[PDB]
Design an enzyme around this catalytic site. Sequence first.
Site, PDB file in Angstrom:
ATOM      1  N   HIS A  89      38.508  64.120  51.674  1.00 20.85           N
ATOM      2  CA  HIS A  89      39.384  63.213  50.966  1.00 20.85           C
ATOM      3  C   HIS A  89      40.726  63.332  51.677  1.00 20.85           C
ATOM      4  O   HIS A  89      41.319  64.395  52.190  1.00 20.85           O
ATOM      5  CB  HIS A  89      39.406  63.269  49.587  1.00 20.85           C
ATOM      6  CG  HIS A  89      38.093  63.242  49.039  1.00 20.85           C
ATOM      7  ND1 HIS A  89      37.412  62.222  48.387  1.00 20.85           N
ATOM      8  CD2 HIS A  89      37.319  64.360  48.385  1.00 20.85           C
ATOM      9  CE1 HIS A  89      36.616  62.263  48.143  1.00 20.85           C
ATOM     10  NE2 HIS A  89      36.150  63.816  48.067  1.00 20.85           N
ATOM     11  N   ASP A  92      46.820  58.212  50.493  1.00 24.80           N
ATOM     12  CA  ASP A  92      47.689  57.044  51.140  1.00 24.80           C
ATOM     13  C   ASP A  92      48.732  56.411  49.874  1.00 24.80           C
ATOM     14  O   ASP A  92      47.987  55.863  48.945  1.00 24.80           O
ATOM     15  CB  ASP A  92      47.004  55.966  51.755  1.00 24.80           C
ATOM     16  CG  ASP A  92      47.533  54.979  52.362  1.00 24.80           C
ATOM     17  OD1 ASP A  92      48.733  54.638  51.913  1.00 24.80           O
ATOM     18  OD2 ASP A  92      46.956  54.260  53.146  1.00 24.80           O
ATOM     19  N   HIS A  94      51.234  53.680  48.859  1.00 23.51           N
ATOM     20  CA  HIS A  94      51.949  52.508  49.336  1.00 23.51           C
ATOM     21  C   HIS A  94      53.526  52.566  48.897  1.00 23.51           C
ATOM     22  O   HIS A  94      54.066  51.690  49.776  1.00 23.51           O
ATOM     23  CB  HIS A  94      51.300  51.382  48.789  1.00 23.51           C
ATOM     24  CG  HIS A  94      50.018  50.903  49.137  1.00 23.51           C
ATOM     25  ND1 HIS A  94      49.469  49.734  48.685  1.00 23.51           N
ATOM     26  CD2 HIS A  94      49.207  51.570  50.100  1.00 23.51           C
ATOM     27  CE1 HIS A  94      48.270  49.612  49.135  1.00 23.51           C
ATOM     28  NE2 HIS A  94      48.128  50.759  50.123  1.00 23.51           N
ATOM     29  N   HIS A 129      45.964  55.411  47.190  1.00 23.68           N
ATOM     30  CA  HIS A 129      44.251  55.544  47.198  1.00 23.68           C
ATOM     31  C   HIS A 129      43.897  56.264  48.159  1.00 23.68           C
ATOM     32  O   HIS A 129      44.717  56.579  49.473  1.00 23.68           O
ATOM     33  CB  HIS A 129      43.637  54.272  47.548  1.00 23.68           C
ATOM     34  CG  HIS A 129      44.055  53.478  48.807  1.00 23.68           C
ATOM     35  ND1 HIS A 129      43.468  53.724  50.081  1.00 23.68           N
ATOM     36  CD2 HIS A 129      45.051  52.432  49.076  1.00 23.68           C
ATOM     37  CE1 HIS A 129      44.222  52.932  50.686  1.00 23.68           C
ATOM     38  NE2 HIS A 129      44.949  52.212  50.315  1.00 23.68           N
ATOM     39  N   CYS A 130      42.764  57.077  48.277  1.00 25.54           N
ATOM     40  CA  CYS A 130      42.177  57.803  49.431  1.00 25.54           C
ATOM     41  C   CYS A 130      41.839  56.952  50.553  1.00 25.54           C
ATOM     42  O   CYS A 130      41.379  55.570  50.119  1.00 25.54           O
ATOM     43  CB  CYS A 130      40.922  58.570  48.617  1.00 25.54           C
ATOM     44  SG  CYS A 130      40.126  59.645  50.009  1.00 25.54           S
ATOM     45  N   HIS A 139      35.455  55.063  49.423  1.00 25.86           N
ATOM     46  CA  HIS A 139      36.188  55.864  48.905  1.00 25.86           C
ATOM     47  C   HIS A 139      37.005  55.113  47.746  1.00 25.86           C
ATOM     48  O   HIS A 139      37.010  55.500  46.792  1.00 25.86           O
ATOM     49  CB  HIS A 139      37.162  56.879  49.572  1.00 25.86           C
ATOM     50  CG  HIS A 139      36.687  57.972  50.229  1.00 25.86           C
ATOM     51  ND1 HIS A 139      36.703  59.384  49.829  1.00 25.86           N
ATOM     52  CD2 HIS A 139      35.494  58.007  51.103  1.00 25.86           C
ATOM     53  CE1 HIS A 139      36.084  60.021  50.574  1.00 25.86           C
ATOM     54  NE2 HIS A 139      35.135  59.219  51.233  1.00 25.86           N
ATOM     55  N   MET A 144      38.463  55.916  43.920  1.00 26.04           N
ATOM     56  CA  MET A 144      39.487  56.975  44.472  1.00 26.04           C
ATOM     57  C   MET A 144      40.921  56.070  44.575  1.00 26.04           C
ATOM     58  O   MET A 144      41.351  56.040  45.799  1.00 26.04           O
ATOM     59  CB  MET A 144      38.969  57.708  45.541  1.00 26.04           C
ATOM     60  CG  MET A 144      39.498  59.072  45.270  1.00 26.04           C
ATOM     61  SD  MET A 144      38.758  60.229  46.368  1.00 26.04           S
ATOM     62  CE  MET A 144      40.001  61.664  46.492  1.00 26.04           C
ATOM     63  N   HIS A 249      45.529  38.348  32.360  1.00 32.90           N
ATOM     64  CA  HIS A 249      46.087  37.302  31.237  1.00 32.90           C
ATOM     65  C   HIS A 249      45.970  38.237  29.919  1.00 32.90           C
ATOM     66  O   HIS A 249      44.851  38.827  29.743  1.00 32.90           O
ATOM     67  CB  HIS A 249      44.890  36.194  31.351  1.00 32.90           C
ATOM     68  CG  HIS A 249      45.280  35.285  30.090  1.00 32.90           C
ATOM     69  ND1 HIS A 249      46.059  34.143  30.100  1.00 32.90           N
ATOM     70  CD2 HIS A 249      44.616  35.195  28.906  1.00 32.90           C
ATOM     71  CE1 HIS A 249      46.224  33.644  29.138  1.00 32.90           C
ATOM     72  NE2 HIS A 249      45.123  34.164  28.378  1.00 32.90           N
ATOM     73  N   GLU A 273      51.393  32.605  32.007  1.00 33.18           N
ATOM     74  CA  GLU A 273      49.972  32.926  31.131  1.00 33.18           C
ATOM     75  C   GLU A 273      48.970  33.666  32.148  1.00 33.18           C
ATOM     76  O   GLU A 273      48.596  34.701  31.342  1.00 33.18           O
ATOM     77  CB  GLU A 273      49.257  31.409  31.004  1.00 33.18           C
ATOM     78  CG  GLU A 273      48.889  30.482  32.308  1.00 33.18           C
ATOM     79  CD  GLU A 273      48.406  29.200  32.302  1.00 33.18           C
ATOM     80  OE1 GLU A 273      47.588  28.806  31.400  1.00 33.18           O
ATOM     81  OE2 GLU A 273      49.080  28.233  33.129  1.00 33.18           O
ATOM     82  N   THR A 274      48.888  33.795  33.456  1.00 36.82           N
ATOM     83  CA  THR A 274      48.102  34.361  34.136  1.00 36.82           C
ATOM     84  C   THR A 274      48.837  34.641  35.563  1.00 36.82           C
ATOM     85  O   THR A 274      49.846  33.966  35.880  1.00 36.82           O
ATOM     86  CB  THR A 274      46.820  33.480  34.426  1.00 36.82           C
ATOM     87  OG1 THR A 274      46.284  33.423  33.252  1.00 36.82           O
ATOM     88  CG2 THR A 274      46.037  34.388  35.416  1.00 36.82           C
ATOM     89  N   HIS A 300      41.196  36.906  34.453  1.00 30.91           N
ATOM     90  CA  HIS A 300      41.088  35.570  34.099  1.00 30.91           C
ATOM     91  C   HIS A 300      39.809  34.745  35.001  1.00 30.91           C
ATOM     92  O   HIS A 300      39.860  33.652  34.796  1.00 30.91           O
ATOM     93  CB  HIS A 300      42.207  34.907  33.513  1.00 30.91           C
ATOM     94  CG  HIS A 300      41.654  33.725  32.567  1.00 30.91           C
ATOM     95  ND1 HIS A 300      40.976  32.713  32.805  1.00 30.91           N
ATOM     96  CD2 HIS A 300      42.089  33.726  31.294  1.00 30.91           C
ATOM     97  CE1 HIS A 300      40.997  31.897  31.587  1.00 30.91           C
ATOM     98  NE2 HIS A 300      41.804  32.359  30.620  1.00 30.91           N
TER      99      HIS A 300
HETATM  100 CU   LIG Z   1      38.426  60.266  48.968  1.00 24.24          CU
HETATM  101 CU   LIG Z   2      46.186  50.748  51.222  1.00 24.66          CU
HETATM  102 CU   LIG Z   3      42.082  31.762  28.637  1.00 24.80          CU
END
Ligand SMILES: [Cu+2]
Ligand SMILES: [Cu+2]
Ligand SMILES: [Cu+2]
Lengths: 334, 334, 334
Positions: A89, A92, A94, A129-130, A139, A144, A249, A273-274, A300
């Site tokens: 493993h 990373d 962001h 994330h891995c 993964h 992960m 939502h 709303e969303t 949604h």
């Molecule tokens: Cu992993």
């Molecule tokens: Cu990424």
């Molecule tokens: Cu709805």
Amino acid sequence: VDISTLPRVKVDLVKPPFVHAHDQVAKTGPRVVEFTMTIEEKKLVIDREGTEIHAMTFNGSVPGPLMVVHENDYVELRLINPDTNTLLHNIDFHAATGALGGGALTQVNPGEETTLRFKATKPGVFVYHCAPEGMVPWHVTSGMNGAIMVLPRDGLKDEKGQPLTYDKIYYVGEQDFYVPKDEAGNYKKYETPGEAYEDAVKAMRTLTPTHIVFNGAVGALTGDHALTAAVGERVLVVHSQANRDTRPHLIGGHGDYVWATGKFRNPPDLDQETWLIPGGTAGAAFYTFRQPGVYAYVNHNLIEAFELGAAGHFKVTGEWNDDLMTSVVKPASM
Amino acid sequence: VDISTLPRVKVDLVKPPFVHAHDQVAKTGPRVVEFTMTIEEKKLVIDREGTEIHAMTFNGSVPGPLMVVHENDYVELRLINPDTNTLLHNIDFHAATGALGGGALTQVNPGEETTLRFKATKPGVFVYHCAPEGMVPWHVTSGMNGAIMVLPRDGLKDEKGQPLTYDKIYYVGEQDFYVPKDEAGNYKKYETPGEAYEDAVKAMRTLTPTHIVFNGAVGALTGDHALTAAVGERVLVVHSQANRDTRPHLIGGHGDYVWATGKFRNPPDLDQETWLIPGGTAGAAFYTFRQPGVYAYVNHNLIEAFELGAAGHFKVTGEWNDDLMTSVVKPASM
Amino acid sequence: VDISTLPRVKVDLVKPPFVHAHDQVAKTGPRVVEFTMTIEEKKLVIDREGTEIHAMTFNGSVPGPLMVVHENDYVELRLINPDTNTLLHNIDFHAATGALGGGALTQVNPGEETTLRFKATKPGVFVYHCAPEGMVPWHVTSGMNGAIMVLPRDGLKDEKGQPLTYDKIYYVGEQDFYVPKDEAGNYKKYETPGEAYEDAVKAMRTLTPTHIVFNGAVGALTGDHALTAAVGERVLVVHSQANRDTRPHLIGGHGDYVWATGKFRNPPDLDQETWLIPGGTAGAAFYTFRQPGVYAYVNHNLIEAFELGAAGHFKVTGEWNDDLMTSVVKPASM
Ligand SMILES: [Cu+2]
Ligand SMILES: [Cu+2]
Ligand SMILES: [Cu+2]
Ligand SMILES: [Cu+2]
Ligand SMILES: [Cu+2]
Ligand SMILES: [Cu+2]
């Protein structure tokens, strides 16, 4: 400056959807924030039927915990891969700059650990994330992944540049799983993570999740684990999806201020709303509750929500406002 | 204030894509706007092949009609479920605050009706849909959704805060259907809505619509039912998708001003080719026509448009502008 | 004004991901910019397995080349369909106004050519694609699409209205292919484009690409064809997807300024991890590199990236910044 001269603060992480204690407005200068995560591969039951996958977790949970720092703090993560695990493993971020987010520097076999430091130069909520070379989507879609919030040092601001202060924060990690099937469509089981690989790849390549869940399982954010609030409380919901688009939502509510793609130097979108959170992104919605009762919080695509699992609840306490909504004539036959 | 002291206005709704008469700038103070919708379950033919589903409609149409009010009006909806229907229905307004959008207060069996009131506190275009507990995506993806526009009291504004006034408005409801198949891939038929349920759920869980249509059927917004405009006319196209992402595009035009996620307190995005409306959202695009002729208006997943049905037309009358576009050398062999 | 009085400039296009020479800030008044594209139908090998499709190209490449002009220039395109081709083609510019983007005026059989002129009235990056009536998604998803950048005459600006000047520009065209399968799931081959049609439509109607690639093939933007930059260089990456949503992400970097839906009159979103480019749209991200080494540039549906092909690399030269990131303790067993 010289990093050794900065304050260090150690944080013990908590399990989602809760978030470790922090301060919205930075009460100190830049710091090195120390975090420790222990990787755990474990069997997880993900639905009411009892379907069980080999999950790959940061700190035992799907999603991994929410880390919180301020802009221009340094994140120092000790990542531990115990010898009870079977796979390689890494991690990373962001939020980070360079070396594939850290992934190039954090490759740990079972029985190894590593410590990574990065400067959190941009404010926002971000996925981590891995991402082991050659194995990345397996993964991530085994659970992960998690998120990190890098707050501006002076906290959150509205579209006019005035303060937005939350009373409560929750972290909803949304997970697409791709459980391989036999020929009639039944889900399969495995003793170890590693005989599952080709069929995991085949299942992923359908681009059709078998399950899409919040906090690691169908119904995880319901019942005794429903999210809670009071009428008048300001709540920030951080939502991540490391692999696949979602559209959160709040049923019966709104996102009063939303950073759909999660980056706080941008003004928020108002009155949503969303909102679309693209795969590989964290977003954040701020809402002040105005009515009590049960709310559903969903992706949604309502099939994804109510059939595949991407639905949780809020239980909100307080007074009902008949000006905002009322039954004039209750359902009846005339 | 006391609601009984407000003016009441009754609106009779019209069939999409047309919109009931309204005023962009509010000519009265806040009002109670009274609407009545009668639920109709009916057989609908949705494609040129004759495929026929059991549709679940508000007011007989897919989508349900566009309701129009102003910010801080009250919407008072009488919802009628005649005894000629077979199912339980309700209504959830994404414009409303509390009680699952109204769904918790409007559960009507066949032979029942109800009246709901809510305050339209946020300006924008919003989805409404049926959402009976345990059955939500089945009703929505059977057509049981529409939209409501809550105009600012002083009408629409551009990115600089100056007025944007439309000459015409249309409402395009986009519907994803999931017609279950036999084993070779043929679509099935049912006598009643209720023996279809498990296979409807199975079909939905593929996340692969069999049909994606505007105004309830393939080609509904074409021919004698094409949308119309004149060169120089300002047109607002409200577009909703209650369950699934879409990406509208006017072929040969633009969205001059677009609220992709539909909320008018935000400045519009300018000069859009295509815009993402997330499932569970209504959006709105404003365009001034500059050329005559046929335009296609599509979901720009062009498979979704031209194979699955998400395409309509405008027929625009007026003068051609050779400065904007001209054939210099018409197609020929040299 | 009279178009014949304007300057004319002829451009010879280059192969993606490179971009023809241009000036960010317009050094002349409005011009007629002359472009020539020759359609080529050709066999292309799209993956490491040797899978071979009948591609439909503008100028021999998937994607077609990036055209660059300034706002209120005229684009004059000579489109040639040589008699060595078998199909009808045309071109639709999302940058243009009228006649289905030009498609209604540019229908060329094999052995024909045509010349279209349009005024580029809106600044942004825009998709262009072939769109023959009745056949539209087949041509687009066979590779027959590219993009055009219409720069503001005074170049790009940040969210505060100050100049953003790039040092390098690349064009990443992302292509969803739908290779039909036999019954066990093997990809098929055809001698001509035309016996493939019904099965191409059937394959498209699954809405599940078999391959999603950058620059026409799995791994095309890697190895000796990796994208390059130096630490401190400002790079614009234009990214298009003519049919299907994508979510670009620079692994180990960010989009410092992003126009996700590609239109330069809008302020850019800042500090993006990932951004949603809707199908039918071009977007653009601006980043200043701060660390050397390998970066992956991906669609952050990581299955789409690492299994289906939507991944390329940057190789960045320069100095490593240990303040931004460092391994404190390299992976080891304690
Ligand atoms: Cu992993
Ligand atoms: Cu990424
Ligand atoms: Cu709805
Ligand atoms: Cu219903
Ligand atoms: Cu073509
Ligand atoms: Cu197009």
